[PDB]
Design brief:
The PDB classes it as hydrolase. It is a single chain. The chain is α/β, with parallel strands linked by helices. It has 2 domains: about 170 residues, Rossmann fold (3-Layer(aba) Sandwich), CATH 3.40.50.1000; about 120 residues, HAD superfamily/HAD-like (Rossmann fold). The protein is built from 11 helices and 15 strands. α5 crosses α6 and α7 packs across α8. The longest helix has 12 residues. The protein is globular, with a radius of gyration of 20 Å. The structure holds magnesium ion.
């Protein structure tokens, strides 16, 4: 059970040693905006050398996987497979693929609130999108899902159209994630998908199926590919309500890093109130502190 203990010394060598793999959130963990966390690339190197699997889990739905993978090299994390990176955009496409309720002849079109990167991910999964060029000579395909992603061009009209589609109770409502906002380099903040999801949910009177963290689906999507043991896996993140909760639901050992959104103070407060799902097992100032555990 989570005690929010600072991970160091003997315990750190025991935890890392027994760990068969590490799942990393990206923003606020590996980097902050234009700046990599010093020692983070070295940690990933040593993990590889120690035979421990590193996987990456991001709620990003703004860039498709190939472009998202570019950030790793850009910020000094070389030698990484695209297959190591899991994003809400990627997992949302796969979930729609699995769940679109249309007949095999026409599984249904997806109405997307989001950018070109997200649309690219969806098409690559073989998904038909509303707004795409119609066949012929032919009507517009029936919309069977609304997907809410990070939409920098969100609008009242798009909100209204989303509601029109959701008038059909058989139409799915899916959101890539529920992150309410994100910190920017200048200290400001940008609205998150969670804020757009709140509007669609409220206007339509429906609850969205959430793909990304802290929903366990992305982990199930990871197990789809690799065989990993949650009991032997670390989940490292900077955001309590997203990353740590995620780790708890998946049965992973959770590590909060302090280089991101959440503060030690919040973690300790949750512990006081006895909300153990939001309490990390361990914390470190930055993931650069984990490296000594590999000796
Ligand atoms: Mg983060």
């Amino acid at each position: 059970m989570a005690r929010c203990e600072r991970l160091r010394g003997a315990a750190l060598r025991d935890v890392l040693g027994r760990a068969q793999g590490v799942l990393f959130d990206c923003d606020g963990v590996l980097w902050n905006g234009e700046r990599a966390v010093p020692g983070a690339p070295e940690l990933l190197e040593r993990l590889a050398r120690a035979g421990k699997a590193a996987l990456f889990v991001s709620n990003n739905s703004r860039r498709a996987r190939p472009e998202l993978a570019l950030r790793f090299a850009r910020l000094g994390f070389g030698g990484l497979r695209a297959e190591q990176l899991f994003s809400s955009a990627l997992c949302a496409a796969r979930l729609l693929r699995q769940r679109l309720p249309g007949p095999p002849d026409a599984p249904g079109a997806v109405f997307v609130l989001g950018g070109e990167g997200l649309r690219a991910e969806l098409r690559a999964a073989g998904l038909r999108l509303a707004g795409d060029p119609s066949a012929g000579d032919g009507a517009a395909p029936r919309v069977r899902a609304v997907l809410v992603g990070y939409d920098e061009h969100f609008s009242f009209a798009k909100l209204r159209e989303a509601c029109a589609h959701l008038r059909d109770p058989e139409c799915l409502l899916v959101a890539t994630d529920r992150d309410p906002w994100h910190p920017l380099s200048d200290g400001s903040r940008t609205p998150g998908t969670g804020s757009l999801a709140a509007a669609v949910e409220t206007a339509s009177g429906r609850q969205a199926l959430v793909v990304g963290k802290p929903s366990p689906y992305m982990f199930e999507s990871i197990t789809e590919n690799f065989s990993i043991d949650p009991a032997r896996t670390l989940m490292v993140g900077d955001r309590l309500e997203t990353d740590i909760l995620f780790g708890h639901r998946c049965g992973m050992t959770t590590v909060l890093t302090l280089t991101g959104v959440s503060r030690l103070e919040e973690a300790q407060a949750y512990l006081a109130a006895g909300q153990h799902d939001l309490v990390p097992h361990y914390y470190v100032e930055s993931i650069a502190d984990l490296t000594e555990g590999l000796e």
